[PDB]
Design a protein around this ligand. Sequence first.
Ligand SMILES: [Zn+2]
Ligand SMILES: [Zn+2]
Ligand SMILES: [Zn+2]
Length: 232
Amino acid sequence: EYPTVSEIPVGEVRLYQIADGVWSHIATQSFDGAVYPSNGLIVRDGDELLLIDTAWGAKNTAALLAEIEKQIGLPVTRAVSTHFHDDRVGGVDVLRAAGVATYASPSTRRLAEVEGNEIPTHSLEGLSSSGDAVRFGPVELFYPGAAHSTDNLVVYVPSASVLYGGCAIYELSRTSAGNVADADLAEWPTSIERIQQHYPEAQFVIPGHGLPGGLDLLKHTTNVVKAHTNRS
Ligand SMILES: [Zn+2]
Ligand SMILES: [Zn+2]
Ligand SMILES: [Zn+2]
């Protein structure tokens, strides 16, 4: 029942209840002639909502807010972007305009700035060192070290045991490395091991793109990253 590019018109967003008061949001975007799905998270925070990641661009993100308004009807009060790339911060201006408080680590903010991307307003402290964790309302934010990017964060919902890996974690269908331009291939498996050692109880693992699964997505990503490292 998980939404594929099948039931998603490019420009539209679907929501998917993973567990009580946790959803993924799914959007699609064209790039280089192909169409890719993309996941974010929504976590209920008392009577408001915390959003993890934009829906990859201004139009998608305005559709995400409209689809939250239609289907959950609680205000989105804060948003966290898990790394600096456009698929996670693209739409930040739309969120801001709607009066959402936008957050990212200083590391993510610096990199977005250098990249010329949208820059979340508020800074998340105490995530600068590999293995650092901080509470952020109904989630824990965790910096595992460099992987898909040097600043990538993962999000864990302790109440539902949902680990949102962002783009640091690949779905099982992805059998080769994606865009790795900004990646730390050397540190990526070590970073995944930090995620493994910190959240062994995770029941649900949501990749940045594609189908949810269990903690074996971590091992899978390690396998794929290692094969790419060994290319010749
Ligand atoms: Zn990225
Ligand atoms: Zn503010
Ligand atoms: Zn991504």
